[PDB]
């Protein structure tokens, strides 16, 4: 959960979701890739 | 609520209102009154001594 | 009630305390949340241009009933590891030290008289 101005998919397995009013990019294979807007 | 009194005092230097209130209950006046919060099952009839 | 700059008496057989010096030892620090030191409290001592740890064993301030009040503030020198610097104590020591929270068994071993 790095909060960044622009959230970008970093691997093929990365996927996007809209939880609690914000946009998230979540990757299960690499937890490093988790980000918030 | 229940009101309790204690420490009997003299009758001479008191207002009439208080003396009339105590005459109804048939007791000599008390120095102080306070209020206690009691449930319905625990209610006690007025005029009952406590120890 | 020992405080910073209090003058204390070394009740011990250690050479460092025994040898006469032109200045008596003075307290430099009290290892308590409060600054006041009572029986069973460690302190930091300044001796002969040197710093050494020490333990309070008696003082002149009144305490609770049934406990002994001494005529002087008595202290014992303690090494950094916690082993006593000296090998003998002759003055009576209170028995309250046994149960107070802390490490007092080593000092109790060296002390003959308990009052």
């Amino acid at each position: 959960f790095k909060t960044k101005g622009v959230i970008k998919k970093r691997c093929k397995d990365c996927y996007k979701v809209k939880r609690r009013g914000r946009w998230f990019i979540l990757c299960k294979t690499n937890p490093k890739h988790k980000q918030r807007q | 609520a229940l009101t309790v009194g204690g420490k009997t005092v003299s009758r001479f230097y008191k207002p009439d209102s208080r003396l009339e209130f105590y005459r109804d209950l048939g007791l000599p006046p008390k120095q102080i009154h306070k209020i206690f919060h009691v449930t319905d099952n625990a209610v006690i009839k007025p005029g009952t001594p406590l120890y | 009630a020992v405080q910073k700059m209090t003058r204390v008496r070394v009740v011990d057989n250690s050479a460092l305390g025994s040898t006469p010096y032109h200045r008596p030892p003075r307290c430099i620090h009290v290892y308590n949340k409060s600054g006041v030191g009572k029986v069973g409290d460690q302190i930091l001592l300044a001796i002969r241009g040197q710093k050494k740890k020490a333990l309070i064993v008696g003082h002149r301030m009144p305490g609770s009933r049934m406990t002994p009040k001494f005529d002087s503030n008595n202290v014992v020198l303690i090494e950094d590891n916690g082993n006593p610097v000296g090998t003998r104590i002759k003055i009576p020591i209170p028995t309250s030290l046994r149960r107070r929270e802390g490490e007092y068994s080593k000092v109790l071993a060296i002390a003959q008289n308990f009052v």
Partner: protein, 62 residues
């Protein structure tokens, strides 16, 4: 029956445990001989080291 603390962990050579009716001291041979704890308790008031200690009095600083 109360619990018992372990003392002397800070020290690397002398450890002592205080039970209700027993006291046990463990130390290395060099430490034991210097303090010579057997002598004191055996000879309660006749210990040699205690005799070496003395008393102090003085009328004036001279």
């Amino acid at each position: 029956d109360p619990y018992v603390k372990i003392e002397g962990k800070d020290a690397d050579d002398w450890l002592c445990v205080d039970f209700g009716s027993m006291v046990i001291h463990l130390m290395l041979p060099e430490t034991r001989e210097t303090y010579e704890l057997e002598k004191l308790w055996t000879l309660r008031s006749f210990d040699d080291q205690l005799a070496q200690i003395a008393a102090e009095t003085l009328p004036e600083d001279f």
